[PDB]
């Protein structure tokens, strides 16, 4: 293996990917090990032989993020009386999830973000929550 | 207000003095407002819509209710427009309809409610409520209609449309489209019908099917025509086949005429829809194996690798009669061509002398006879009309060729719709083969979650194609259960573990 | 913003913002030059936030920082000069960028006062050190590398 | 306060925790799911370096630490002209 | 009874089964990447399949373009040779 670009199948990679992703924006466990490999993984998306997939993984972690604060939103106005607290947990999770996310994206967001209107990915998973869970919800969240 | 903060006030009271006389008057009454958009968007009042737009676009909490309000008024005005239309011109009106609303409810928002993005994302999700809208308990209607539409605008039509025709309405065909939450009914009919338009030659023009192939391209990515492109470039090169062919045939040690001609229409196996499916037992007639046998070997000595499995039930053949006097020419298929040529050996044919001949179960055999004897080229030579074992024909010579095109292949020109519930009946067969691959994909990834933890990753990554039912992956998930593959976990079913 | 992402070029090459930062720009003598000076400090803060190409080149490849940097009054305007390459810098600016003379900007930095300034807005970093050495040794970088870097040896 | 940054032929490669961040994939890579609060090895395993660049870029790590507050004819630093386009990907990846 | 006129389709398959050009990720019986935004100026019919040793099919230049700089089989990391 070496750093220069190959070719990469966008679904293998990005699924062993995104049993990561999954686990660390809910601060689950994924080992040193694994997430030291998915920074490779990332890298080898980012400049992939001949069409760097860059842009695919940006669009497809933007949808999997509206597809989890979607979920956790779902998770929160469900448990109407106790919405403040599902939210400070749900809330105190994504927080360092997303941070630890802009953490494993940072050759994305400082080789292909910063390049191109486009969020890194620690902004994108905040920008998700507030129009995904904190703006549906501002009606119910600031009311209790 | 604005005017006359600047007479006075400070510049950076500009803002504030004219905020604090928003939440005032604009805000302190926002409710009323709210108690009343409904109107507004119901009767669709221009200068009161402006009004409203730019009144509640300073309020924080104003705009949404207008924006979920019209997207209710959108999608109450598509399902008043598209579900009144008649059964016979239906593929054209409801695409005209879908068109007309979209181009009605963007010029509103672009120019009245100055285009902001969240409102032509109301009007997207109207447009995808009314499109994707089916009778209870029913299938969908978008992906059949839309790509009938397609069908009856791209073939020959007798009405003379120009290319600009299908330059224009393919392209607002299009925005129609985006709005199909069902893709994969959708491309698997438009992939049947080109088919059956590229076989039989009623396609228009192969122009106007390259760009419609690419608008669907830059619709929904390259997966989406992979296999229409692919069967497009197979009916472009067609042509040069048949010419290389003639060169391979003009350039042999020895000079061969064919005799019968060669028109091939050479396919790649994955790309089309078409398949073997019956038995096809039918043995090549004796005049098509000379031109056959020295396919074969130009298929094997200019392309090597390339299986050919032949199709003989698509085959066209003409088919000239010299015993009945030789009337015109007739057309016919060559999935019944080797009884036609017993009836060059005996005027009378029987069951057991036809199975022997042309090789093939009668059980289309006898649909073939009826479809030769239905135009009194083939008479009945005995009485019992029903599937016997003796059942004789008899050729009838007192009856000519009516045209100089005697025409059978019309029985296969024409695409029947009794196929269409068999290629529902495909999609949904494929569609459980496709989502069982990616659930397995997904519980050998993970192996930890939820069950509707488990929904919302199914349909994540089904947002790529049609959308699942419920029901739908509730049923996988049963036919994971009974195939050894996931079981419920012992804390509780909710959980779900790969082994 | 709507000029900058039209990105307006003159017959030199010079973008909006290097003659936001070029002492060269020909103020009207009428009564502009009474107030409008470049280059001027707030104008190129602005055309930086209203999202100007930093990298940008002339048809002989000086960048806004190859044009700062040969500025003719260091000491007066100090504080011109210092905020144009503190925004300069800020916005993403490679301080080593090679023009079509591979002048590096410390190169092409008439005053010392501009170089230290410079240099003590300079990161150091190994990939420019490589990019100078592949550079250097011509060592063919088509494919070898990602694109990014297959430009990145390409201005340094 | 000593990472221990693995190549891929298997050296380690143990650095001061405080050269090692410089760089923007290994101050990112101990930050996270990787943190070592036990603080025993650091292992920050690279499967893509090889041996012989990751040691040119921990040379680079205690020559930027070393020659940042200069300013006055800091020497060159020798990158190899076979280890270059070696060593440009491995600065590219971990950030310079 | 002879006729004089007939026409005939055939599916056809390759012997090992492959779908797409694992470099430009198109079909390998369609064009590559490169040329199928330059399908006017060149022929845009050169761009055949090209098979290696290993039984994996990329486009011509997909493969020839991609053994320009470096030696190696893209999908199993092995030496190539056109078979
Ligand atoms: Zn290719
Ligand atoms: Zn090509
Ligand atoms: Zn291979």
Redesign the interface.
């Known amino acids: 293996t070496s750093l220069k670009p190959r070719v990469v199948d966008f679904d293998e990679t990005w699924?062993?990917l995104?049993?990561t992703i999954?686990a660390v924006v809910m601060l689950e466990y994924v080992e040193r090990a694994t997430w030291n490999d998915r920074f490779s993984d990332i890298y080898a998306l980012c400049v992939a032989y001949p069409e760097p997939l860059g842009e695919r993984l940006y669009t497809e972690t933007k949808?999997?993020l509206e597809?989890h604060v979607?979920?956790l939103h779902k998770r929160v106005l469900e448990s109407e009386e106790q919405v403040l607290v599902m939210y400070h947990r749900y809330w105190e999770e994504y927080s360092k999830g997303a941070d630890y996310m802009d953490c494993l994206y940072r050759y994305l967001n400082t080789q292909f973000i910063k390049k191109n209107p486009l969020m890194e990915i620690g902004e994108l998973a905040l920008d998700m929550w507030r129009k995904l869970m904190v703006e549906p919800l501002?009606?119910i969240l600031i009311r209790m | 207000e604005e005017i006359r903060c600047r007479k006075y006030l400070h510049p950076s009271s500009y803002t504030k003095v004219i905020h604090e006389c928003q939440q005032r008057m604009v805000a302190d009454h926002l409710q009323f407002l709210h108690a009343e958009c409904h109107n507004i968007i119901r009767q669709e009042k221009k200068n009161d819509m402006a009004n409203m737009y730019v009144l509640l676009r300073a309020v924080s909490?104003g705009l949404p209710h207008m924006i979920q309000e019209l997207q209710n008024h959108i999608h109450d005005e598509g399902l008043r427009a598209t579900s009144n239309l008649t059964q016979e011109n239906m593929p054209t009106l409801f695409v005209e309809s879908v068109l007309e609303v979209h181009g009605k409810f963007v010029q509103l928002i672009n120019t009245v409610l100055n285009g902001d993005q969240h409102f032509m994302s109301a009007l997207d999700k109207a447009l995808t409520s009314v499109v994707n809208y089916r009778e209870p308990k029913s299938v969908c209607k978008a992906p059949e209609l839309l790509a009938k539409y397609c069908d009856n605008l791209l073939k020959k039509s007798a009405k003379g449309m120009t290319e600009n025709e299908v330059e224009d309405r393919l392209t607002s065909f299009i925005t129609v489209f985006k709005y199909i939450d069902d893709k994969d009914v959708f491309q698997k009919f438009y992939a049947r019908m080109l088919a059956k338009r590229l076989?039989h030659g009623l396609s228009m023009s192969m122009d106007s099917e390259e760009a419609m192939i690419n608008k669907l391209k830059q619709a929904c990515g390259?997966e989406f025509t992979?296999k229409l492109?692919?069967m497009y470039?197979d009916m472009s090169v067609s042509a040069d086949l048949n010419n290389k062919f003639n060169n391979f045939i003009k350039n042999q040690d020895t000079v061969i005429d064919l005799?019968?001609?060669?028109?091939?229409?050479?396919?790649?196996?994955?790309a089309?829809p078409?398949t073997?499916a019956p038995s096809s037992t039918f043995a090549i007639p004796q005049?098509?194996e000379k031109?056959v046998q020295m396919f074969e070997l130009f298929?094997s000595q200019h392309?090597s690798?390339?299986?050919?499995?032949?199709?003989h039930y698509?085959?066209?053949?003409?088919?000239?009669?010299?015993?009945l006097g030789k009337p015109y020419?007739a057309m016919v298929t060559?999935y019944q061509?080797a009884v036609?040529?017993a009836?060059?050996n005996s005027e009378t044919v029987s069951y057991k002398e036809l199975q022997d001949s042309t090789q093939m179960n009668e059980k289309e055999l006898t649909k073939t006879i009826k479809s030769l004897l239905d135009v009194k080229m083939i008479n009945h030579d005995s009485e019992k009309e029903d599937i016997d074992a003796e059942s004789s024909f008899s050729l009838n010579m007192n009856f000519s060729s009516k045209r100089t095109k005697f025409k059978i292949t019309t029985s296969m020109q024409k695409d029947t719709p009794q196929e269409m519930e068999q290629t529902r009946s495909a999609v949904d067969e494929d569609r459980k083969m496709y989502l069982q691959a990616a659930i397995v994909?997904i519980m050998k990834?993970?192996k930890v979650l939820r069950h509707?933890?488990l929904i919302?990753e199914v349909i994540?990554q089904s947002?790529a194609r049609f959308n699942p039912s419920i029901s739908m992956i509730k049923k996988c998930i049963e036919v994971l259960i009974d195939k050894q593959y996931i079981e419920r976990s012992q804390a509780s079913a909710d959980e779900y573990s790969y082994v | 913003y709507n000029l900058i992402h039209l990105d307006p070029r003159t017959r030199e090459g010079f973008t909006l913002l290097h003659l936001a930062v070029n002492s060269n720009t020909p103020v009207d003598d009428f009564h502009t030059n009474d107030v409008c000076s470049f280059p001027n400090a707030l104008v190129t803060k602005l055309l930086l936030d209203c999202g100007a190409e930093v990298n940008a080149v002339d048809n002989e490849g000086n960048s806004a920082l190859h044009i700062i940097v040969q500025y003719n009054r260091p000491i007066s305007d100090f504080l011109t000069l210092h905020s144009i390459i503190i925004s300069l810098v800020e916005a993403g600016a490679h301080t080593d960028m090679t023009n079509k003379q591979n002048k590096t900007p410390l190169d092409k930095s008439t005053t010392g006062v501009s170089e230290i300034l410079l240099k003590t807005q300079m990161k150091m970093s190994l990939k420019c050190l490589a990019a100078r050495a592949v550079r250097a040794n011509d060592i063919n970088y088509q494919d070898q590398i990602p694109r990014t870097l297959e430009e990145f040896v390409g201005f340094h | 306060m000593y990472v221990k940054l693995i190549s891929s032929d298997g050296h380690e490669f143990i650095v001061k925790r405080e050269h090692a961040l410089t760089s923007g994939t290994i101050k990112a890579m101990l930050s996270g799911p990787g943190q070592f609060a036990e603080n025993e090895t650091n292992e920050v395993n690279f499967r893509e370096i090889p041996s012989h660049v990751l040691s040119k870029v921990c040379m680079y790590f205690t020559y930027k630490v070393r020659y940042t507050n200069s300013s006055t004819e800091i020497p060159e630093f020798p990158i190899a002209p076979e280890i270059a386009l070696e060593l440009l990907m491995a600065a590219n990846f971990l950030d310079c | 009874?002879?006729?004089?006129?007939?026409?005939?389709?055939?599916?056809?398959?390759?012997?090992?089964v492959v779908?797409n050009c694992a470099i430009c990720?198109?079909?390998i019986?369609?064009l590559c990447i490169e040329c199928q935004a330059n399908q006017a100026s060149a022929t845009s019919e050169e761009c055949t399949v090209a098979?290696g040793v290993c039984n994996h099919a990329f486009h011509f230049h997909c493969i020839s373009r991609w053994l320009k700089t470096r030696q190696v089989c893209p999908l199993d990391n092995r030496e190539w040779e056109f078979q």
Request: hydrophobic content about 45%; overall charge positive; charged content about 20%.
């Open positions: 699924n062993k995104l049993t999954k949808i999997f597809n979607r979920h501002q009606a | 909490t076989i390259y992979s492109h692919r470039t005799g019968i001609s060669f028109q091939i229409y050479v396919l790649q196996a994955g089309w078409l073997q005049e098509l031109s298929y392309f690798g390339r299986k050919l499995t032949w199709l698509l085959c066209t053949g003409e088919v000239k009669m010299n015993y020419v060559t061509m036609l040529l009836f060059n994909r990834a993970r509707n933890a919302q994540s947002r | 009874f002879e006729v004089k006129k007939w026409n005939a389709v055939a599916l056809w398959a390759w012997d090992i779908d990720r198109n079909h019986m369609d098979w």
